[PDB]
Amino acid sequence: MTDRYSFSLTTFSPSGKLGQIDYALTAVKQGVTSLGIKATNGVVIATEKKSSSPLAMSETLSKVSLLTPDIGAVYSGMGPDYRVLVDKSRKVAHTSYKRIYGEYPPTKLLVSEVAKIMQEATQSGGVRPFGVSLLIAGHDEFNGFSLYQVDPSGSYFPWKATAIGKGSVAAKTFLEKRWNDELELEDAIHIALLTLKESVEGEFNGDTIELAIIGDENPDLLGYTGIPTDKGPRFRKLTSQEINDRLEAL
Amino acid sequence: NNYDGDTVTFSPTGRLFQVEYALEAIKQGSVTVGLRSNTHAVLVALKRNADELSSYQKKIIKCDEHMGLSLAGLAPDARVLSNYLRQQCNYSSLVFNRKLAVERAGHLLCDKAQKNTQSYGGRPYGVGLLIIGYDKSGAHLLEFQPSGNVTELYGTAIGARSQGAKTYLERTLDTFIKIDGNPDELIKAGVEAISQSLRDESLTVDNLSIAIVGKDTPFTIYDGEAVAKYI
Amino acid sequence: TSIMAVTFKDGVILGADSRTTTGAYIANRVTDKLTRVHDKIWCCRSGSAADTQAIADIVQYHLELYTSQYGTPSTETAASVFKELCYENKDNLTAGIIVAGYDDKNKGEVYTIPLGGSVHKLPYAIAGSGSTFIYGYCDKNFRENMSKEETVDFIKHSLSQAIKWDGSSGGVIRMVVLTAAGVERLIFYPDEYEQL
C-alpha cells in the first residue's frame, strides 16, 4: 500500500490553464444557486433546498452553516466537499486563532484560512481540487459587516452583493439594479427573496428556501446570562415561518 | 503486452508476465543438476566462462554446515537469497540451538519471493535455486522458482538444456536412490546425468563444480583437480 | 478498600464498601466501586482510583467492540483483557481488580488480578486493604454451591468485619448479583450491618 501518489494531479497545460481548477469551476456552475447581500446593519445569505427525494427530510441537510457565532457560510457545487470544508473551517477557527488570541477570528482571516486549504488541494500530491465555491458572511468589531466569495483555486474577493452557481449571471444583474449603500437589513432580505425566486422552478416557500442573516446580537440565543460583554451570536438562521411572513409582503 | 509493465498487473487470462519473464532468465542460465540417495545429497553444476582469459562463474553457495544450493539465472539475486538463507539458518541455530529443516528453508524462500510479486515498485527475483541438505529426517533436495513455488524432489535439473538430465534421472530413479553409503557412485550418477545436457563442450577440470552433503559429511564444494577423478 | 466476589449455585455476587480516601480524609463516603464492563461482567476496583477507572473504561471499550464483532465475550476473555493492561503496564499502574461474570455455559466465574498482573481463577476472591482482616473468616465460612440468601449473608458479614477493622473502608455495603434472571443492585446501611 502506502499513498504512492506523491506528485501533482493539477498541472499547467501548454496554454497556461490549470485544467483541474477549470473543471472544478464547471462543477460549481452546475450547482444550485446561492447568493449574498450586504446592508448597512447586516448581511444576508440564501439558497434553495433542492431536495433529492420527497421522502428525504431536507431539514436534516444544512446548506447554510454556522462557522463562528458571527460568521456563516453557504455554497454552490459539490455538497460533500462543502461539508468537510465546514468541518475544517470550524476547527481552524479554533486551532489557528481562538486557542491563541482568546477570541473568534475576523471574517477576512477565517476566509483566508479556508482559501489556503483550497489552494493546497490544487498543488499537493495525489489530490483533486475542491468542487465548490463558498459565500462567507460575517461581522467583527473593527471591520464591521462583510461578505466574501471563495473559489476552487483558493482565490477570494469581497462583495457588496453577489451570486454563484446555476443562475448567477442573471442574479448578479438583478442585484446591480437594486443595491445601494443605504439599505437596511429588512430591505436586503426582501431583495434576496426577490432575486432567489427567479432561479427557482418549483415550490417557493419557507420549507424549500434556506436563509440566514448576520445582524444584531441575539442575547436570547446565548444560553446564559451574567456577563455584560457577552451579548450573543450575530448569526441567525431564519425559520420556515419567518420566511413565509416576508413572502406575503413580497 | 499491455499487462507486462509491472508485477502488480494480472493479464486477462490471469497471468503475471513479469514473473514469467523472470522465469525466462533461468532458462538462459547454465545447467545444474541435483540428486539424492537416503544417506547423501549431491549437486553438480556446469560453470560458464566469459571467454578463454576469464574465470568460470561459480554456481554453488554454502548456506550452513548441513545445507547449500546451486544457482541458475541472475547471480546477484542468488547472493541476496542465499544471504537470507544463511541468516535464517543462523537465527535457528542461535535462538533455538536447532539446525534449520530443509523443508522450512523452502517455505521461507517461497514467502520472500512472493512479496516481490504483489507490490508496486519492486521486481521478481531472476534466479532459480537447487537446495540440498541433510537434517533430522535425512537427505533432501529442493527446487526454487522465483514465482515462489518450491518443490521437494529425488532429483532434478534447471538451466539451459536441463531437460536431458531430468529425463535421465527419471529413468535412473530406482538405481540412484539405492546408492547408500557410497559417495563416489552417487556423484558418478550426477556427473553422468549432467552429461546428458552437454553439446559441443565437455566436462573439463575448471568447467565442473560438485557439492555433497550427507550422514557424516558436511556441505563441501569440489573444484579444480578435486573433480579430475570424476572426469 | 474492602472488595470481594463469590460464586454460588445460581451465579456470582460482587461486594464492596463505599469509602474513598486521600490520607485520613474521606474524599467520598458514598462511592460506587462495583463497575460494569459488560451486561453481566462487572469488576471490583482497588488501588489508585485514577488507574482503575482508566483501566475499566478501556476494558468496557474493548468488550463493546468485541461484542459488535464476535458476540458476548466470556468472563475469561474479560479477565484476559484486564490482565493484558495490568501486566504490560505494571511499572506505571497501581491496580488490584477482581473480575466477576455470568455465562449460561460457564455459569458464575471469578478471576482476581493482583498488582503484578497475574491471573488467578478462584471460587471466591477478596482484595483491598480491608481484605487482610477477613482471610481467616472467609476461609472458614465459604462453601461451594451456596444459595443467593446465604451468599448475601456471607458477603455482608465478611465486609462488615473488614469495615470494622480497616479505617480505609466504610460507608454503605454495595452488592451486585449476577444470575440468569438478570442484574440486581443491593445496598446495606451502617445501622444494619454494624449490629451483626
Binding site: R99, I100, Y101, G102, E103, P106, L109, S112, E141, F142 | - | -
Partner: protein
C-alpha cells in the same frame, strides 16, 4: 540557583482616570554583582506596553518573540493589537512551555483605542492571567510593591497625580530589595500621548 532571582528587577502598573501607568527599575545583575544600570524591562508593540521581570535571557527572548508575533498580527489583521487581545497571546505563549517554562513575570498595560478604557494585567511564569482593576506588581520585590500599592493607591487619579503615586511605589519598594534599583523609568499613558520619565534614585 533559583532562575527567577539570578538577575533581579521589578515592574509595577496602575490605572487612573482615562490613563494607565507602567514602571520598572534598570538593574541587571549576576546575583550579588551589579552588571548593568541601563537594562530596561518595559517594551511596547504599538500602543500596548509589556513589562517583564525574571531571568534576563528569557526577558530578551520573549520581547523578541512578542515583537515577532505582533508584527505578523499587524500585517494580517491590518490593525494594531489591543491590550485585551495581547494579554491572551502572552498567556497562550507561556502555557505552550508548560513543562519547560520561561522564568518570567510579565505585566501588560494600555488603553483600548476604540472604547478608551484603561487596561492592566499580570501573569505567572506559566500563563495564568491576573486582571486587576487597580494595580499589578512583579519581580524580586513584589511583596514590597504589594505593600506600597495597597496603601498609596486610590481610584480615578489624574495623570500627573498617578505619576507621583506609582513613582513613590516603585522607588520605596526597590530600596528594600538588594537585587532591584540602579535607576527607574515611569511611563504615563493617555489615549494619544505617552510620556517617559527617568527618576533620580540612590545607586546602591
Amino acid at each position: 540557583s533559583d532562575p527567577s532571582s539570578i538577575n533581579g528587577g521589578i515592574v509595577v502598573a496602575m490605572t487612573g482616570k482615562d490613563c494607565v501607568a507602567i514602571a520598572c527599575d534598570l538593574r541587571l545583575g549576576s546575583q550579588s554583582l551589579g552588571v548593568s544600570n541601563k537594562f530596561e524591562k518595559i517594551f511596547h508593540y504599538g500602543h500596548v506596553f509589556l513589562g517583564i521581570t525574571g531571568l534576563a535571557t528569557d526577558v530578551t527572548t520573549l520581547n523578541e518573540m512578542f515583537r515577532y508575533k505582533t508584527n505578523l498580527y499587524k500585517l494580517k489583521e491590518e490593525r494594531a493589537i489591543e491590550p485585551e487581545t495581547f494579554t491572551q497571546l502572552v498567556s497562550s505563549s507561556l502555557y505552550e512551555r508548560r513543562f519547560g517554562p520561561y522564568f518570567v513575570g510579565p505585566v501588560v498595560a494600555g488603553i483600548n483605542s476604540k472604547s478608551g478604557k484603561p487596561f492592566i494585567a499580570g501573569f505567572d511564569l506559566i500563563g495564568c492571567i491576573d486582571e486587576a482593576k487597580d494595580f499589578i506588581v512583579s519581580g524580586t520585590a513584589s511583596d514590597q510593591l504589594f505593600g506600597m500599592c495597597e496603601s498609596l493607591y486610590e481610584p480615578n487619579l489624574e495623570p500627573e497625580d498617578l505619576f507621583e503615586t506609582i513613582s513613590q511605589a516603585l522607588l520605596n519598594a526597590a530600596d528594600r530589595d538588594a537585587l532591584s534599583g540602579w535607576g527607574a523609568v515611569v511611563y504615563i499613558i493617555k489615549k494619544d500621548e505617552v510620556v517617559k520619565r527617568y527618576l533620580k534614585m540612590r545607586q546602591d
